[PDB]
């Protein structure tokens, strides 16, 4: 029986969640035109 929510769980998501969001913002940017 393994736990689901751990300090490890938090470290991981503390980085992965904003990364994916930032990757989404940056992908939109490739379609900005001047």
């Amino acid at each position: 029986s393994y736990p689901i929510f751990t300090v490890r769980w938090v470290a991981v998501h503390t980085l992965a969640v904003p990364t994916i969001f930032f990757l989404g913002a940056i992908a939109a940017m490739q379609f900005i035109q001047r």
Binding site: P3, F21, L23, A25
Partner: protein, 82 residues
């Protein structure tokens, strides 16, 4: 060997994992996307839009030249585009 957390290779080959994360990962991607496509990123951070670095017949940088009036100076420059 191990400190009793569930191994990563067990988690990411597991079906429950991908059931949650095929939603959470695209949703985040689309959220960040909308952050930019709506223009909200510009307004939160104060980043000039391509049409608002300069005024039409201006080629001076709107450079902050005062420490304690600096916030007021930026606002002055920004009005000179409106």
């Amino acid at each position: 060997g191990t400190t009793g957390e569930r191994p990563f290779s067990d988690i990411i080959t597991s079906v429950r994992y991908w059931v949650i994360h095929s939603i959470t990962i695209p949703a985040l991607f689309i959220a960040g996307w909308l952050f930019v496509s709506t223009g909200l990123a510009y307004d939160v951070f104060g980043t000039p839009r391509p049409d608002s670095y300069y005024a039409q017949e201006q080629r001076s940088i709107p450079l902050v030249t005062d420490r304690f009036e600096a916030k007021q100076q930026v606002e002055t420059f920004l009005e000179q585009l409106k």
